[PDB]
C-alpha cells in the first residue's frame, strides 16, 4: 500500500465537505482511483490490485449515506477484480482501472444531462418550483426548463445547517432563473404558491424511500398535503443495492459545530446536546416520480432499477475485500 | 401630543425586536402607557386623553401580527375612554390609565403561571417535548413539569431566521431541563421520538387557527402525521377579536437581512428576492388543545373565548380613535 | 280556512322551483302570511288564528330540506300564537302577523348584506373563487369583494340538473366579475387554480354538517384534498333546530324529468331508474368557516347558534298545531 | 399523397366525436390505413410508403389525449416501415399494412373480451357498481359479471358535457342489467351504497396515473374516501410510452358549445369564458387495480407494461416521419 | 366513621366488576350513600357529615376511570355539604343525602331513556349497527330504533377480556333485535357492511376525547376510514370536569388473570408480562356526535357541557374533604 | 385410488387446525404426497399418476385461503405430470414425486431462515415489535434480531378466536425474548410505544394486498396512522397466482364454536349468528415492505414475484386434473 497523495486529499475533501453532492463525490472517488493507477510505481499486477483495494477502502470510509460513492468504486473495482482474477499484466490492469473510471465519470455527466431533458418535460410554462439543498440533477431539470423558454421561478430553501441553498440560489440566479429565497421553516407557508417540487437524492431504497438532505421529508410531506408533485431527480447509481437484502442506510451525524459555531458552542451548558443529522428519509407514498437517465418511474419501481443493474453483485462479497 | 421619551424607546425596541414575544410586547406597551400617564405635564383631562390616544397609536403601529399588543392597549384604553366620557379630573384619569395598566401586567404574569400549572398536568414522566421559537407560556409548562419531578427532555428547534431557539435552549438548560438542539428541518426526523409538542401563539382566530412563529405549521403537520399531541399555550389576550368579523390577520414580513446578512446580501444578484415571513398559520385540525389561564379547550372553542370577553367591543370603533 | 289566493300561488311557485334559493323561499313564505293577514275577511281573532295556521301548513309542506322556510314561519307564528293566547283583537293579531313578517323579510336582507361584508374580508386581491349553484349569500360575498377593488375571478360550476350555474354566471358576469364556467365534473381538475371556495346552505346541523345543492360535498372533499378554504355563507335561520334532538334532515328527491326530459325519458327501458337528490350533506371536517350575519364561526359552533336562538322552542310543540 | 376519401371521413368523424371511445378510435384509424392500402392506385413501393405516412399524420392530428390511437398507427407503421426499409414489392407492402391493421383490430376485440373475463372475477354477487362515461372495456366487465349470474346493479353517471352516460345506461339496460342514473354531482351521495367502481382509460402513464373522461378523478377521490375499489379497465395499448421520457399528456379542450349550446352561448356576456376539458388525471394512489388483457396489476406496474412492449421504440423517432 | 355494611359490599362489587357499566356504578354509589344516611345510628349532624365523607372516599377509591362515579358522589355531597355548613339538624341532613341520591338515580334513568329517544332518530330503517362492550346508553338507542319499527341488525364485538359482548348479544337478541357476533379483530372486515357505529363512554374530556372500553379507539379509527358515523351515547355526568384544568384521566389496569386465567398464567415464563388496560382513548376527529339527554353535540362542544354544569366546582376543593 | 392412510390423517389435521400456519400446511401436504409415492402398492405409472392426482385433490380441498398449500402441490405435481407425459417407469415417477417434495420442504426451511436474516436487518437495537398470530416467518425475524444482540421486546396480540398469541408468547419467551401480552383490542393503545410491526401472510395478491389472520388489517391501519413500519414476512410460495387473472381469494369461515364454545353456544337465542372469518385483507398502502427469501420488496412488486415464478402455469390448467 504505497497510496498516492491525491487519494488522501480527495478523502479529506469528501469528509470536510469541500467536495459534496452525491453525484460529485462519486466522480471524485473514481477520479481518485484513476490518479492512483496512473501514478503507481508498481512492478507486479498483485501489487496494483493491493493499492486500488486500499485506496477503495479509504474512499469508502469517508461518508456512509450517499450510495453513489460505493457504486462508483464498485463500477471500477468489479472490473479491475475480474481482470486480475483472469490474469492481466501491469499496464492492462492499470488501464482497466483508468478506463473503468473514465466510463463512470462520463456516464455520470451524461446521466445528469439526460435527467434534465426528461425532468424538464414535467415543468410547465409559468411554474413555481420549490427545491431543497444543492442537487446537480435537480438543477439540471430547472436549467433545461428555463432554456426551453418556460418562465419559471424557483423557491430555494436555505437548507441549514451548511447553507447549501446559498449555492443553489446563486447558481440559478446567474442562469437568468429568478429565485425566491426562504428559510426552511417557511416551506408550508409557500407550498400553496408552488406548482412542483424538484429535489435530489443521496440514496434510494428497495421500497422507494428516498434518503436526501435533512428537511426533504418535511417538504415532501406538505407537498403531499397540498397535492404538489414531488419529483426526485437521481442517477441510477444513487439507488442502494444492500437495501434489497434488508440493510437500513446509515444516517450520518456531522459535527455539532456546523449547527452552533465552536466559539459559541463551548460556552453553552453541558446539558444541551446539539444533534446534526445530515439526511432524513422520505417515504415513497409522498414521492410522485423519480427522474433517472433511463426514465420516469414511480418510486415503487426502485426495486426494478436495483434488480436489473446491481442485484447480481449481492450473492458475491464486496469487490475490494 | 407631548409624548414622553419612553413610549418612543419602547416602540423602537418592539420594532427592532429587542423586545419580543407576544406576551411581553403587550406588557411593554401597557408599561409604556403607564409611564406616559405618570410623567404627563398635562393640565386638563382632554389634554391627557389626547396624549394616551397618540401613545396608543404609536405602540399599535409597531408590529401587526401579535394581537396581544392591541388587546393590552384596549384593556387600558377601553377604561380610560369610559372615565373621560363620563367626566373625570386629571389625577382620576391619570390613575385609571396607571391602574388599568397595572392590572394587565399582573394579569399576564398570573396567566402565564397558571398556564404552566394547567399544561404541565398533560406532560407525563419521561416525555420528550418538541417546542419551537421562544414562548414564555410554552416554557411555563415545561418548567412546571420539571418542578413536579417528571424527567422530561426538550427538543429545541433553532427557529431561524432570528435564532430564538438559542434563547430557549439556554433558558431550559439552566433550569436543569436537558435539551436536544436541532435545526428546523430536522423536525420530522425527530417527531418519532417526541411524545408531545408544546408551542405558543401570537394570534388565535375565531375558527381556532393559530398564528405563531414561522415553522409552527410544519411541526404541527408532522406531529399530526405521527399522532403526537400539539398543545398551544396561550393567554386569552392572544385571541383575535377582529377575526370574528372576517378579518384575516396580517402576516408581518421582516427585513431580508435577518435571513442573509447585509454585507453578504448586497453582493447577490438582483434576480434573487429574499422573503422573510415572521409567522405562519396552523389549522385547527392539527392542534389538540389550547392551554389558557381559564383552561384547556379544543381549538374550535376559540370562538367562545372571543365571544365572552372581546365581542362587545366590535359593534364599537377602536377606543383610541 | 278561507285561505287567500296568493298563499296557494306562492306554494306552487315554491314546489315547481319558480321561487328557489333557501333565503328567498323563506321571505316568500313570510310574504305569503303577510298577504293572508292583510286580505283576511275574518271577524274574530280565533278565525284569523285558524287561517294563518292553515296557510302555515300549506307553505311548510312545499319543500322539506331548507329549514330557512320552517324558521320564517316560526318567527311569524311563535309571535302570533303568544298574542292570541294572551288575548288580542282582530286588528292587533292581523298586525302582529304583518309586523312579524315585516321584521323577518328585512332581517334576511340585512343578514345577506352583512354576510358579504364579513365574507369579503376573507377574499384577497387576485383570488380565484370556486362556487356551486346559485346562493345569494355566497354571491353577496363575491360582489362585496369585487366592490372593495380586489381582482377576483369566479369559477361557476353549472350545477346540474336544474342549471343554477347559468343564473350565477350571468349575475356575476353582469357586475363586472369575470367568470369561468365549467361542468360539475371539472371541479377537481380546476381545484389547483382555485384559492377559495364560497358556497351557500339550505340547512346546517347541530354537529356542523352542511346540507346544500347536490355536488357541494364533492367540491368540499377535493377542496380539502388541496387545502383550499371552504367557506359556507349562511344566515342563522339556515341552521336546523330539530337536529339538536337527533332528527336527520330529509333529502328531497325531485322529479326524474329534471334530469332526463319527459319526451326522452318515456322512451327508455323500464329497468333504468333516474334518481334526483336535490341536496347532499357535507361533513364539518371539510368546512373551514361558516359566515353568518353574527360572524365567522368554525362549523362545530353550529350547535351554539342553535342553542342561543332556536333551542327554547324544542320543549314546545310547533307553533301552528 | 393521393389519399383515399375514407381516411378523411374517419378523421372528421373522430374529431366531431361521431366516432369516440379510445379503443374504437384506434380500430377506426387502423381501419382507415387498411382501406388506404387496399384502394391505393400506386405503382411503386416508395409511393405507397408516402401515402400511409400521410394518412398516418392526418389520423394522428385528430385528437391528442387517447394514446390508443398513436399506438394503433405505430403497430401498423412500425411494421410497414421495416418492410419498406428491408425492400419489398408493391403488393408485399400493401399486404403488410392490411395485415398489420387486421391483427390490431382483432387484438383489440380479444383484449376487451379478455378484460371482461378478468374483471368480472372481481365483481361479487349483489354488487352495486358505479361507472363513468361510456367505456367498452368497463362495460365488458359488467356484462360478463351479469352473464355469470351475479345480480349486479349499475350506477351510471350522466357524464356531462357530451352525455355519454345515456349511451351507457341504454346499453346495460338492454342486456338486462338494472341501472340507476344520476347526475355527476351525485357521485359522493351514492358512494356509500356502491361496492365497486369500474371505469375505463384514454391514457395510462409511466407512474400509473390514469387519464380518462372529465370527472373520473372526483369519483376516484371519493371512492378512496369510502374505501370502495376503483378498478380501471384498459387495454395495453392505452398505456402512454412518451411519459416514460417525461412527457405530460396533452389534455384536450373541446368546443365550449358542447357545454352551453351555440344559440344560447352567443347571447352571454363577453366576460364569461366556458372551459371544456374532455379529460382529467387521476393519481395512482386512488386506483386499486388496472385490469388488462395480460392481467390485473397495481397501478404502479404501468411502467412494466410500457417497458416490455413499447420501450424499444423510444430511442427511435416516430415510424411515419 | 361507623360505616354501614352495604357501602362496603357495593365497593367490593364495583371493584370486582360484579357491578359494572359507568351509569350503573354511579347509581350504585349514590344508592350506597342513601342506605348509609337511612341506617345511620348517628346523634349529631357533625357525626353524619363524617360518615358520608368516609363512605364517599371508600366509593371514590374503587375504580378511577369512569367519572360518572365521582359526579354521582359530588351531586350528593355538594348539597349535603352546603346544608351542614349552613346548619341543619340530623333528620334534615339525613334527608338532603337521601333526597339528593334519589334525584340522581332518577335523573340517570331519565337520561338513558331520553338518549335512546334522541339517538334512535339517527338510525334508519335497514341499518346495520356495530357496537362495542355493554353500554346501557348505546343499547337504549338500538332498542328505541327497533321499537320504532326500523329493521336493524346489530354487530356485537365480543369485547375481550371480560366478554361484555356476550351480555350485549343476549340482551338485544332477547328484545327481537338480530345480532351478528364477531371477535374484536373482525371489526374492519365488517366495517364495510356497517352503516352506523353506536358505542358508550366512561369519561368524555374537555377537548372531546372519549374514554371507553378497550378497543373503542380502533373501531372508531376504521369507522372513520370507511366514513361510517361513530355516535357516542353518554349522559352528561360522563363528562370529566378535572380535564378542564389539564388533568389526564387515569387508565385503569385490571388483573392480568382476566386475560390469561390464574391456573394457566402461573405456568408461563417470568419474562412474559400480561398487560390489561380496561380502557382506551378515542380522539374527537373520529367521533361524529355525542348523544346526551340535552341533545346531539359535536364532540368539540364537550367543553360547553362541562362549563355550564360542572365548572363552578373547580375553584373549590372536592366536597368530601 | 388406493390412497395411503397418512394422506387422510394429514388432511384431517389440516382441517381441524392441529396442523396450522401456512408454511407448515404446505410442507405437511408435500410430506403427504411423499409418503404416498413411497408406500404405493402400484404396478403401472398410470396407476401412480392417478393416486397422486387424488391425494392432491384431497389435500387441496382442506382449507382454501393459504395459497402456500396449492403451490406446494403444484411444485410437486407440475414435475410429476411432465415426467409421466414424457414417459417414465414406476420407480422414476415415484422418485420424481419424492424428490420434488424433498426440494420444497427444504426450500421452505431455507426461505424462512433467509427471511429472518433479511428481516432482522430492519430491526434496530431497543425496538418494540408488535406482532399478530403465530407466523414462523415473522418469528424468524425476531429471533435473528435477538441473536444479533439487539434488545428487543415483543408485543404479542392474543389473536382470537384460536389464541395463536399464546403459542407466540411462549415460543419467543423461551428464546430469552421478553414479551408483552395484550388482547387484540389493545393494539392502538400500544401502537405509540411500538417501533415496528412484523406479521406474516397466508396469501399475497397481484396488487400487493395481504391476506393474513383476522385482525392483521386493523393493526396495519393503526400502524399506518402512527407511521410505524408494517413489514410482512412471507415466502414466495405465499403469493397467489390466480389473482393475476382477477380471482379473489376465498376467505375461510370456520366453525362458530371456536368463538363461543359448543356447551355455551347451544343455549343462546336463535336470532344471534356467530360469524368467524379466519382471515382479513390488508391493503398495500398500509404495508411498508414484504420480506421474502429473494429480498425486500414494496408491496406493489408482488406482481413481479408472481410473473417470474408462477405466471407460466396460468395459460395451462391445474396439474392434477
Ligand atoms: O448528487 P446531486 O444531485 O448533485 O446532489 C444530491 C444530494 O447530495 C447532497 O448531499 P450532501 O451535500 O453530500 O450533504 C444533497 O442531499 C443533494 O440533494
Ligand atoms: O408570548 P409568548 O408565549 O412568550 O411567545 C409567543 C410567540 O411570540 C413569538 O414571536 P416573536 O418573537 O414576537 O416574533 C413566538 O412566535 C412565540 O411562539
Ligand atoms: O339561500 P341562498 O344563499 O340564496 O341559497 C342557498 C341554497 O339554496 C339553493 O337550493 P335550491 O335552489 O332551493 O334548490 C342552493 O342549494 C343554494 O346553495
Ligand atoms: O376505450 P373505451 O374503454 O371504450 O373507452 C375509454 C374512454 O374513452 C372515452 O373518451 P371519449 O369518449 O373518446 O371522449 C371515455 O373517457 C372512456 O372512459
Ligand atoms: O354507562 P354505560 O352506557 O351503560 O356503559 C358505559 C361504558 O362502561 C363500560 O365499562 P366497564 O364495564 O365499567 O368496564 C363500557 O366501557 C361501556 O362502554
Ligand atoms: O406461514 P407462517 O409464516 O408460519 O404463518 C403465516 C400465517 O398463517 C397463519 O394462519 P393459520 O394459523 O393457518 O390460520 C397466520 O395467519 C399466520 O400469519
Numbering used by the authors:
A (entry chain A), B (entry chain A), C (entry chain A), D (entry chain A), E (entry chain A), F (entry chain A): 3 to 323
From the reporting publication:
In summary, our study demonstrates that PH0208 protein would function as a purine nucleotide dependent R15Pi enzyme and not as a homologue of the regulatory subunit of eIF2B. AMP acts as an activator of R15Pi and in its absence the enzymatic activity has been found to decline dramatically.
To identify the binding site of ribonucleotides, either co-crystallization or soaking of PH0208-WT, PH0208-C135S and PH0208-D204N proteins with AMP, GMP, CMP and TMP was performed. Complex of AMP and GMP bound to the proteins were obtained, however, no electron density for CMP or TMP was observed. In case of both the mutants, PH0208-C135S and PH0208-D204N, AMP occupies a similar position to that of PH0208-WT protein with the major interactions arising from the three subunits of the hexamer. Similar to PH0208-WT, the adenosine base ring interacts with Val251 of chain B, the oxygen atoms of ribose sugar interacts with Arg124 & Asp290 of chain A and Asn209 of chain B while the phosphate group forms hydrogen bond with Arg229 & Trp231 of chain A and Arg190 & Lys194 of chain D of the mutant proteins. Thus, it might also be possible that the binding of GMP to the ‘GMP binding loop’ is an outcome of crystallization artifact. Both, AMP and GMP bind to PH0208 protein even after the mutation of the catalytic residues (PH0208-C135S and PH0208-D204N) at the active site pocket.
